[PDB]
Every structure is written in structure tokens, then in C-alpha cells.
Amino acid sequence: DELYLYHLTLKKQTNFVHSCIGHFVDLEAGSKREQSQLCVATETHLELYDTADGELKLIAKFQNLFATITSMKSLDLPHWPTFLALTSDSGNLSIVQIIMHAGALRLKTLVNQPLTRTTLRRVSPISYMEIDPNGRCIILSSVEQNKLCFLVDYAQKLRISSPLEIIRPHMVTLDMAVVDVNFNNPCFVTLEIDNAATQLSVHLIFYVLELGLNHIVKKADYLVNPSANFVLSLPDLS
Amino acid sequence: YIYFITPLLEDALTDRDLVHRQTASNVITHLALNCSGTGHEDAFIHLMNLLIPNIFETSPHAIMRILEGLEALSQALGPGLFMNYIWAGLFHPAKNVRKAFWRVYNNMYVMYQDAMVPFYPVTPDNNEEYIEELDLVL
Amino acid sequence: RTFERHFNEERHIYHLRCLGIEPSSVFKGITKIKEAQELWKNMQELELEEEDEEGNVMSKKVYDELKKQG
Amino acid sequence: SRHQFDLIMCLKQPGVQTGLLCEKCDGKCPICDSYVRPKRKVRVCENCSFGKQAKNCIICNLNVGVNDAFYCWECCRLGKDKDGCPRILNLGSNRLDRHFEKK
Amino acid sequence: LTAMGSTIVLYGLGKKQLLRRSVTQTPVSITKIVSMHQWNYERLAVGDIHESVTLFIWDPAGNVFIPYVDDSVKRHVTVLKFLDEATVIGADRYGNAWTLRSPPECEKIMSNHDPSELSNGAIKYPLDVITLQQKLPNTYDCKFKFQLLNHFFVNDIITDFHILDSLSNSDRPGCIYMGLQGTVGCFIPLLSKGNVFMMGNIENIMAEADDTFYLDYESRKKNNIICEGSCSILGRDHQEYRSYYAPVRKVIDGDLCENFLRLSLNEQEFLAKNLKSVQVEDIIQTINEVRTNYM
Amino acid sequence: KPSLSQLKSQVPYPQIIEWYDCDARYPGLLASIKCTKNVIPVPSHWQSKKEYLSGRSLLGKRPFELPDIIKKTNIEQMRSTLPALDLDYKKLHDVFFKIGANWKPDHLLCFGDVYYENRNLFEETNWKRMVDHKRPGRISQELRAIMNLPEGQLPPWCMKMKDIGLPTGYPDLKIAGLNWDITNLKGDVYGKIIPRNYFGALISFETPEFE
Amino acid sequence: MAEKQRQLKLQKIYKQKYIGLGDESTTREQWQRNVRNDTLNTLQGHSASLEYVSLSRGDLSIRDTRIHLLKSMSPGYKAYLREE
Amino acid sequence: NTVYVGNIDPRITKEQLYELFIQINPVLRIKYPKDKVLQAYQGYAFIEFYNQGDAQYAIKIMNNTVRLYDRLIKVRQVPIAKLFIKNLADSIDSDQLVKIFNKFGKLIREPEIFYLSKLKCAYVYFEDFEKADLAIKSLNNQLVANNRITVDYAFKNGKGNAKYGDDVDRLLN
Amino acid sequence: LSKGENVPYTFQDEQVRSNPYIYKNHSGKLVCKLCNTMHMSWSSVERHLGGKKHGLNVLRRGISIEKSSGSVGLAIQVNYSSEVKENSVDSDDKAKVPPLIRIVSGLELSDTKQKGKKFLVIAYEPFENIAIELPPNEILFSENNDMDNNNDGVDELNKKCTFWDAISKLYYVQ
Ligand SMILES: [Zn+2]
Ligand SMILES: [Zn+2]
Ligand SMILES: [Zn+2]
Ligand SMILES: [Zn+2]
């Protein structure tokens, strides 16, 4: 008497929330390496596109992911294709390498580190993700509560260091954009607004991860007017 | 296999001594966890209706097994259909019923944060600020 | 307990009923005659189109009255 | 643990390293102590690894561990998997009272 | 048939303006009516913002709609449609796609009685429903309830449902929706108890496949796909992600069973050994049947 | 501490509010939650010191009874309980899957039901089963022996219905010799009431096969 | 005894990790704040419910609605809008 | 909506009652009290129908119609001014009291003559507190039948409070 | 401990009991249905019966019970035993009490099937009761036979028209 149903997605969700710029696989060429290529994801859906022909081409539309991808970034690490560092629901940092397997491109996982709990939730250190431009450390955060940093290493096998925490209990975070560095030390900037305050105060704050002592440091805290929006990094000035 | 054993759990959850009510809830944990999403869900409402009165029961062993039982039934019924029982005495005058229900609300909150969001009992006049954007329609 | 049973009784129902407040379960919290009165006080348009097409404001019963005069 | 109340777990951010169980505690979920259907590997925080203490079993923390410790399927469904580092710290009253009872 | 914020109004045409042919006040709980639909001028289904849906009847000579059924869970409805006389599909703000069925005990009363009897007059209800009215006036105030028929989590916000009697001459009537982010998807009813059993077993295979590869890997390292999320590429289980706000009930995902086609032959023949049933080729046949035949 | 009369005035369903709801820390909010749509009240055995079960109701409960489907499997005779088995595996496997596929308990419970101590379901199921079989116009042979009313004989109230008329709640009731033919009276029946596919119809029913 | 004394401890830990958890006595304000934060996080997190809010409010850009929701989590944000 | 039933065989079961009375009308509920001491019913019942009309019709049809175990079943259906008066004359009959107090107020019931200490006193029931105010105003400390009589309110300390005036005013209205 | 007595289960639907209270419920444990007490072992039961609360409940049940609950005539000649079995019982226990007669209406019988006539029942302690149907509304119902002497015995019927030859054991009634 019941009603049994069968679901199909005929045409996938089309609103692209994420992109990453790296060079992923070597296709149809014996040896070629060029940084022009891009991978684009919307929550569940994911795709790979190519360039350098002057006009963007579709390469591969990968298998159904069945999750909510909350950030996607290409990390490039010194000494090699690029693989995308991908955080999502399930609270798992998932470093994924798209590859050429059998007859068609496949989406292959390398390391997924457990974080928080499996859902979208405000404590979950996702929704803000960025990578040191030299590929030394992935860095994650959440609104309110915690911020994490994983120190990336590469060897015969990919290797992820244990996370580095900073816990600011009431500070809810926005616009995590990270400053590039010369190998000196990874540094990143946030606009943090306080959850419990009698007035509206959004202050920008700098963090410098000290590779020497292996912890993240609060360096400069500057209060700005409540209308603050976002942050970008200026590379050098020298 | 459920369907047969709910009248068996019927007598177990009813019985006087506190051991049957304990041990039977342990059946409800292993049954509700891996039978969730199968589409029965009309037997788990029955089982819950038998469990809820046991929340006030003391002793460590029965209370942890009962709580685990309610948590397993949360995934069989779903967060909201399970919450409809709790919101009532979640405040309450009695300092005890309150102390008892805030625990189940703690476990439910740990299992579900954004899963309970549509299900809060909040209207614009129920709380001061509410959220103006939940009332928008396009 | 005896007082909680006093709320459903012949006599108390005679006091509510003879006071003018219809006795029922909703009125069982309370002794005092004053507040029950405010409780009872808190307990207690169609456009039928005249042929001229100005009766678009004209109510049902009004258009029935003009059925009687018409 | 589940059966013994005086025990206190760690519950910190799980690191990249897997816990280990002694031959005696082998094949048990650190949470509910269920021998059946394992699911995932446990992971322990830095402050639970460091030196020799890393080699000990993560339940009894006395004997040396060998096999990786697994979360049972149910504790992964309930999500008690990802709470934190599931390493027992204190030894509990039972083991001590045994030790001094014998001699 | 228009919906004010609280109340439902029925307008007919007139000259110099249009006029109110009927007005019906809603029960206390309903605040706004976001979407609503009819069944062949006999019945209504009315959605809210916060609460779920309520089914009415057009009562002539009472010139009013009388609620005979309500829902047991708070659900925020974007859109709503009658699948049949007794059942309804709806969507949610939060990405849920659900289907409700009015219980049979109510349907016997609905077929065996006139609408005018419902509002006033006597339909003798079983004592149970009454005692539920006295015991729970806030819940059961509108008698009976819905029984949840299907529930499914598709992360979009479904804007429109479209029920079709046939898709490209196919036998099984489907229902194709379209979401906010843009999407199209189809719920096809499976007519058999056998095919839902095959598709069920295939969904169960593909569901924990990422767990099967992993436990196999460990077991073959003990005696002689490295990641735990190997075949899922991410961490979500199928039942958890597809459940979320509430457990899936009868809806079995065909977008998971459709990935089995894209696996390598070694992996397909590896997963298929879990069944005493038919081989891989027949699995691919069963999967590929729905797009060929059913639409 | 606002009086409950002042408190009941805020509530669309004021009949739930109780004298103790006056005394909550947040009575205005609690009165809004408790009367919100689907919330089911706290079980009522709080403020009782009896540990939620006192034997007075529990002394007379029946030990247990197997479902009729399982009792059909004959184990009741094989193993003696109150106060080598040789069972067919095909039979048992057919009982749970093929035979009992759709079998569900008679009662279960609805969403709003909560089980209070003195409640007993064994009576309520017998009351549903009672309303189902017992019908107007018919009388059981046992009750006919109690009334000394042989078959084919009109009941003793037939005359007062001749004077006063048919039952009010039974307009469609047909009684022999009055609104309905007297010869059709036979046996136990002296009167009788004489007034899809749901889009998912499975059209095939196949249980999982053992072999 | 010792079991309850573990219950208090796990209470303090989970209240730290997961932020809002009612204990026994929690003011209506303390709880309604948690409800507000959860709701806003759901509205911003899912790109669906963010599209819906952005189109409904008719704002010029998605990021304006998202930052509006984040800012709304601070109490002083209401008064800040009133001073404009 | 509930009717009383009596002269029931203790051997009768709720099943048999329901089967009997459903012939007459739909029966909402049957409360058929049992002694929980002896598990033996007391031979009476309360049958609650859905409306009043069914109850009345059932009373009319089923009363003394049917014999259950030879036993013929039975079916059946189911605050004012007061004045104390002291030092009355022994020549005053209750009817003379009636004629005295009628002009002041309409008597809901008859007066009650009782002897205290020897001392003839009475209670007089009026339908109105104001009519009783007239009776006290004129009759208090007045000589009738060559005996001085005193008229006041009867104790419950006596009637005539403010709440008494209010709720008596309502019961009248 | 139990003195070898079988204590039946609560559900067995009643061999006379010693104390008609202590049972075994559907479970194993022992119960006292008055006091609603659960006892683990028979010794605890014997302590319950020897306890003070059970006595109070027995008395309260006692009060609870004690508050509720020229013409034609016929002549009968009933004969009794010839010192055959009455040789074992002679302890002046109502032995001086003669047989008694009463007129009973058939409206009440163990079977309750047919009725509508009276019976002239005659009873004696050991022997079984005896009845005689009286269709005639009235026979031999006299009018002040003796001169109003008041030793009611049992009733006007017995003194008025009965004789008990106790020496020969012959009861005459007319
Ligand atoms: Zn640790
Ligand atoms: Zn160990
Ligand atoms: Zn476990
Ligand atoms: Zn006793």
C-alpha cells in the first residue's frame, strides 16, 4: 500500500561555489606541465575544465559525491601534479587527487583527517579554508569557537602533521584571506566580531604561525569600524 | 523482524521491576540504530511512547540504558518528531523534570545542531528578536 | 486533592453557570470570581454585485433585502 | 569507559596517529566496548602520543598495544566517533584494588 | 481561489471590480499560506511557512473549507502538489522533499459521509480520536494526522514540482521537480515488490562500498583504497547525508546506484560477490532500465 | 508571579495551563511553548512519589502471549512453559517473510499517546475489536440465550419502536416487519443498515525468496 | 556518586566544544541566543537557503546577505543599523 | 449524555452490554464499575452516548423491555438567602411565617422552626438578598403575636458578605 | 520454609489456601495483594504476615467488608438418621437447634433459568436442604391459631406450625 520511490538527478546543480586554479593531470600529451586548468565544485557537484586553447573546455564530470563541499582549494607543494585540498561536511579534511585511471578520469583520495562532527554546524572548522601559497600548511577555521591548521609535508607518501589549535570562545570569524610569505612563516588575517558584546565591534586580527615553537600566535589586534567587510593580502612591497 | 518483537518489548517496558525496563531499552538501541531509515517508524513511535515516562527513573544503569534508547530512537523518528515530546518540560517549574529533560536535550543537541534548526518552537512574539528572515517568501 | 475535585462538582458548576460563565475544563484553574469574568470575556462579509455593478460593495443580506424589494 | 565510571577519557582534537590495543583488549570499541563489526581507526591527540605512553593500550593503559583500535559501527552512526581522543587517563579503582588486594 | 495571510478567500468575477464569493478562516496555528493546491475542485492542501500542510474540502451550502487532517511535524513548505486524492508531495526551505498520505480511518469517513456533516452535525468518531482531542488539544485539534509516506533530502530548494502521467510514452507516471540552484530530478514510483528489492540491494552495496574496500584492505594486510573515505572520496555515509533533517523512508536513491556503472570491472565484480543473486551484467541491466524504459 | 487567569489569557489553548505553570521561572514563555502546535506534555507521574510503578495496577497483568502468527508455528506445543524440536526451516522462513510480510500488531500507538501507569492496552484492543464485530440489527447466540430470544423472533423492544419510531442515530436501520420485510428475518439478523491505486500501486507482490 | 561526578565533567567539556548546551537553569535569553546563532548559521551555510534569502531580500550581492547574517549574531548589530 | 443502567447480573460482561445497547444507538463509552476487591461488578452501569437525543430515546425504548438472566433491566436518566430569627412566638405556624415573609420576598423553600436553649427560632429562605434586606429592615426587633422577634442572617460568620451579595446577585440573574 | 504449600500464580484463575493473599506474580517474585508488597524469599513473607502493616490492612479489609453485603393444608414428615453417623459429633454445638423451614422465591437460583413459584425449604446442619414447590398462592395460611404468645423462635411460621420429635428424629410440618 506504501509508495516506493526512485530518485534521479537529471541535470545537476549549476551554481558554482568553488574553484581552484592548479594543473591537475597530464592528458593526451606525453610530457607537458602548464598551470592553466581549473576545477569547479558546487556542494555535491564537481567538474574539471581546461584552458590554453583560448576557450574553456570540459574534461571530466566526476562521480556523485554525496556530501556538502564547504571549501575547495588547490595546494601546490614543492617537489608533481597539483591535488585539491577539499573540506566539506562530515568534518573531514579531504585531500583529493584527480587522476587518469582505466579509460577515464577518476577522483582519488589521499588523506582525510577527522574534524568535529558530521553535519554543517557553526563549531565545525570548515567554511573558511585557505592554504599557504607555498603549500606548507592547510589552514581551516569555523565561525565562533575554534581555528585549526594542518602542517603539510610530502614524501614517498603524503603526510599531514597533527593540527594546531587556537580557541577564541566567543569570536565569530569572517573573511579568512591569508597573507603570502617568502618561507619566513605562515601568516593569516581574519575579521573577527564578538558574539557577546553590548556594542557592535568587529576587529581585524593577524596570526603568525611560528614554525620554531609549532603554535599559532596572536600578533596584532586592531579594532576597525563596525562596517568592516573583507580582507586581502598585499604580497611584498619591496 | 521488528513488528513481531514490539509486543515483546511491550511487556518488558511495562513491567514493574527496573531491570526489564533497563535491558529492554538496550534492545531498542541496537534495533533503532540500524533499523532507522528502513521505513517502519510507526513501531518506533510506539516504543518511544512506552519509553518517555522512564526519563524520571533513577539508578545509574537503567538511566544510561534508557538515555541511549532515546538517542537511538531519535534517529529512527528524526530530530523533530522526537523533539515534540521534550520541548514541553524543557523549562517547567519543577527543577527536576527540568533537570531530567535538559539532559536529553543535551544529547540531542550533540547529535544534531543544524538538524534541529527548523524544529525550534519560536514565533516572532515568542522571543524578542526572533529572525526576520525566516518569514520571507519569494 | 479534594479542592482539585471541587472544580468539577455540581455546586461549583452552579456558581460558574449561574454567574454567566459556561462551566468547562478551560475555566478550571481558579477560585476568584473576578478574574473568571475577564477569562469569559476573552473567550467571547461578501460582495454580492448589484446589477448596476455598483453593488460590488453590497453585502449578502443587503442584496437579499433588495431581492425582497426587487 | 562504559562499564567503569571512575575512568576519565581525554577528549582532545584527534591527531594523525592511530591508537593501539593490547592483545587482551584487542578488538574492542574504546567507547561502548563492543567486539563486533568495526568501522574506522581511532586517532589520538599529540599529548596522548609523545613517548612510551604511546605504545600502551588505549583502554587499560598498562599493557603494550599491538593492533590498531577501531570504532564500532554504531558508535560511528551515533557520532561518538568524532568526539575527541578516546584515551583513558587514570587507571580506575578496580585495577588498583586488585593490585593491592593480591599484594 | 486566493490565500490571504491567515485566511482563504474565494473570488468570483464582477464588473467594476471582482468580489468575494466565500471567506474561510484558518485554524489557529496557520499564519501565512505560501502554497496550496486542489484535487479536482473537491479538495485542498494548504501549506504554511512554519507548519506543514492541512487538507480541506469544499463544502457547498456551508460555503466554507473544513480541515479534516493535519501534520505531526513542523515543516517549512516552498511548494506543494496533490499526487493523488489522498496523498501530497511538498518541498522545504531546508532541502527536504516529502510525501504525506491521509490515513485510511479518515478516508472511510470521507467517502462515507457528506462534507456538511463534518463542521456541524454528528459523525460518530471512534472513542480514541475523542480522548486524543481532550488529552491533546494543541496537537490533534484537527482530527487524525498525516502519516509520513516518503521523506528524502536533496540539498536544493525545490521551486516547482510537476506530476506527469507518462514520460515519453513510458508506463510509470513520474514526478519531475526543479530546484532553486537549478536542477531537475525525478521520483519514479517502482511498481513491484521485487524491483524495489533489487534496487534496494544495489543501494546497500554501493552505500558502504567505501567501508568494504577498507575492511578488505585491513584484513588482507593482516594475512597475505587505502583511505577510509576511499570509495566515497569524502566522509559522509549515504544514510546520514540523505537523512539529515529526518530519515529517508521509502525513497531509494538512484543517483548512488548510478555510480556503479562508472566503477572499474574489478571493483564491480568485487562488490557483486556480496549477493547470492545475479551477476554484474544483470546489475548494470537493472540500473540502466530506468532511463531507457521508465522515461 | 502572574496569576494563571492573567496567564491563560495569553494562550490560544488556555485549558492546558495549570496552577503550577504559574510558578515557573519563565511562565510567559512556557505557556507559549506548551501550547505550541505539536508539543506533547511531560509525562504526568512527576510529583508522584510512587517510583512511577506501584504494583496495585501491576499485580494482575498477564505474563505474555505470542503473536498468533508465531503461535501458528506450533512451538507452543513443542516446548511446555506454563506453569529434537524438528521444525522445518522453510516453514519458519515462510512465516516471517512470505506469510507475515505485512503483519503488524493490532494496536501499536499514535503519535500523541503516552503510557501512564494505570493504562492497559489489552482492554483497549478488545474495545476496538468489540466495536468492529458488534453491529446493530444482529445479536450473538449467547446473548440470545441470555435474553431467551430464539432466532427468527423480533426483539422485545420492537413494539416500543413501532410506537416511538426507529433509532435516532440509525436512519438507515432496516428492521423486520416495520421498515423492512419480515420474511427476510432469519437466524440472528433482525435488522441491517441499508444506505484509486494512489499513484503507487505496486501491481506485483514478491517476497524475498529463501532458496 | 562518581558517575554523576563524571556527568558534570563531560557536561563542562561538551559545553565547551559544542557551545550552547542547557544545563539545568538557563535563562530564556541564554537559550534564545543559541537558537538565533544556530538558525543564522543554517541560513548562511547552505547555499540553497542563502540563495533564497538573498533573492527574497533583493540584495545586490550574495556576500551582502551572508555578512548580514554573520553580523546579526552580535547583539549590538540591531542598534548599529538604527544609527545609520 | 450518559444514562444510568441498573438491575444488572454480575455475570454480565461489558461486551454483552455494548452488544445490547448498540442496537439502540451508537454508544460512545461504557463505564461499568467493578469492585477491584472482589473483581465483581456491582450490578449497575453508566452508558454514555454521543448526544442527548440518543440518550433520551434509549431511556424510552429500553426501560423495563429486556430480561437478562430473567432480570428486567432498568434504564434511567441522570446558594440562596437565609435568615435566622430568634424569640418567635409559639403561636406562629410555619404557614403564618410564609404569609409574613412573602410580602418581603419570594421563598425558595419553607422556613425551618427549631428550639434552642425552649427558644423558638427559624430559618427563612429568600430568593433575593435585597428582599431579605427589606424583611430585616421592617421586621427586625418587632412585636408579633405579642412577642418581640429578632431577624438577622443565619451563620455559615453569617451570610451577607460582599462576595455573598455579588454571587447571590448573579445566581438570581 | 513454605511448609510445602503450592502458592499459585496471580494469573491462574482460582484446594483451599492457607493465607489467601501471598501469590507469585507473572514474574518470579512473591506478592501480598492487600499490602501490595513484593517479597524476595518466603522468610520475608513470613515476616510480612508477622508484620504490623499487614495486620492494619487485614482490619481495614474487615471494616470494608462489614459495611456492605375449614380448608385444606399440607403436611410433611421428614425422617433423620438412626444414630448411624451422629455418634461422632456431640459437642453441644447447636445440637439443641431443631430443623428450620423457610419459604423461598424461585427468583434466585444457582442456574437462574426458570422461576415463578415458592419452595418450603427445610434445613438441618449436617443433612442437605430440601424443597417443596407451592403453586397454590395460599394454603393453610391460618388466622390467629393460638392466643398470641410471643416466643418468636425464628419466625411465626416455625412456632405456628412445626413439630420436632427430637427423641425419634422426626420433623413434621403443617
Ligand atoms: Zn588524548
Ligand atoms: Zn588493554
Ligand atoms: Zn562502539
Ligand atoms: Zn500484606
From Swiss-Prot, chain E:
Cellular location(s): Nucleus
Signal peptide start-end: none
Cystine crosslinks: none
Family in the record: Belongs to the RSE1 family.
Subunit composition and interactions: Belongs to the SF3B complex, a U2 associated sub-complex of the spliceosome. The SF3B complex is composed of at least CUS1, HSH49, HSH155, RDS3 and RSE1.
Function: Involved in G2/M transition. Required for pre-mRNA splicing and endoplasmic reticulum (ER) to Golgi secretion pathway. U2 snRNPs associated protein required for the pre-spliceosome assembly. The involvement in ER to Golgi secretion is probably indirect and due to the splicing of the pre-mRNA coding for SAR1, a small GTP-binding protein required for COPII vesicle formation from the ER.
Name of the protein this chain belongs to: Pre-mRNA-splicing factor RSE1
Portion of the full sequence shown: 1042 to 1361 of 1361
From Swiss-Prot, chain F:
Transmembrane segments: none
Source domain of life: Eukaryota
Disulfide linkage: none
Subcellular location field: Nucleus
Misc note: Present with 1830 molecules/cell in log phase SD medium.
Family per similarity comment: To mammalian SAP 145. Some, to C.elegans ZK632.11.
Complex and partners: Belongs to the CWC complex (or CEF1-associated complex), a spliceosome sub-complex reminiscent of a late-stage spliceosome composed of the U2, U5 and U6 snRNAs and at least BUD13, BUD31, BRR2, CDC40, CEF1, CLF1, CUS1, CWC2, CWC15, CWC21, CWC22, CWC23, CWC24, CWC25, CWC27, ECM2, HSH155, IST3, ISY1, LEA1, MSL1, NTC20, PRP8, PRP9, PRP11, PRP19, PRP21, PRP22, PRP45, PRP46, SLU7, SMB1, SMD1, SMD2, SMD3, SMX2, SMX3, SNT309, SNU114, SPP2, SYF1, SYF2, RSE1 and YJU2. Interacts with RDS3.
Functional summary from the UniProt entry: Essential splicing protein required for U2 snRNP binding to pre-mRNA during spliceosome assembly.
Protein's name according to its UniProt entry: Cold sensitive U2 snRNA suppressor 1
Organism field: Saccharomyces cerevisiae (strain ATCC 204508 / S288c)
GN (gene name): CUS1
UniProtKB/Swiss-Prot annotation, chain H:
Residue span(s) of domain RRM: 1-78, 81-156
UniProt xrefs under InterPro entries: Nucleotide-bd_a/b_plait_sf, RBD_domain_sf, RRM_dom, SF3B4_RRM1, SF3B4_spliceosome_assoc
Ranges that cross the membrane: none
Primary residence: nucleus
One GO term (biological process): U2-type prespliceosome assembly
Classification via Pfam families: RRM_1
SUPFAM superfamilies the UniProt entry points to: RNA-binding domain, RBD
Recorded GO CC terms: nucleus; spliceosomal complex; U2 snRNP; U2-type prespliceosome; U2-type spliceosomal complex
Swiss-Prot/TrEMBL keywords: mRNA processing, Nucleus, Repeat, RNA-binding
Single annotated GO MF: RNA binding
CDD domains xrefs: RRM1_SF3B4
Keyword tRNA-binding part of the UniProt annotation: no
Annotated compartments: Nucleus
Superkingdom of this protein's organism: Eukaryota
Biological role stated in the UniProt entry: Possible SF3b-like factor.
Additional remarks: Present with 1240 molecules/cell in log phase SD medium.
Subunit structure: Interacts with RDS3.
Protein name as it appears in the record: Protein HSH49
UniProtKB/Swiss-Prot annotation, chain I:
Major subcellular location class: nucleus
Entry keyword set: Metal-binding, mRNA processing, mRNA splicing, Nucleus, Spliceosome, Zinc, Zinc-finger
Top-level taxon of the source organism: Eukaryota
Renumbered zinc finger spans (Matrin-type): 30-60
Keyword hit for Magnesium: no
Subcellular location: Nucleus
GO molecular function, a single term: zinc ion binding
GO cellular component, as recorded: catalytic step 2 spliceosome; nucleus; Prp19 complex; spliceosomal complex; U2 snRNP; U2-type prespliceosome
GO biological process terms held by the UniProt record: mRNA splicing, via spliceosome; spliceosomal complex assembly; U2-type prespliceosome assembly
Keyword Zinc-finger: yes
Subunit field text: Belongs to the CWC complex (or CEF1-associated complex), a spliceosome sub-complex reminiscent of a late-stage spliceosome composed of the U2, U5 and U6 snRNAs and at least BUD13, BUD31, BRR2, CDC40, CEF1, CLF1, CUS1, CWC2, CWC15, CWC21, CWC22, CWC23, CWC24, CWC25, CWC27, ECM2, HSH155, IST3, ISY1, LEA1, MSL1, NTC20, PRP8, PRP9, PRP11, PRP19, PRP21, PRP22, PRP45, PRP46, SLU7, SMB1, SMD1, SMD2, SMD3, SMX2, SMX3, SNT309, SNU114, SPP2, SYF1, SYF2, RSE1 and YJU2. Interacts with CUS2.
Function recorded in the entry: mRNA splicing factors, PRP9, PRP11, and PRP21, are necessary for addition of the U2 snRNP to the pre-mRNA in an early step of spliceosome assembly.
Family: Belongs to the SF3A2 family.
Miscellaneous section: Present with 3460 molecules/cell in log phase SD medium.
Protein name: Pre-mRNA-splicing factor PRP11
Organism: Saccharomyces cerevisiae (strain ATCC 204508 / S288c)
Complete-protein stretch covered: 34 to 253 of 266
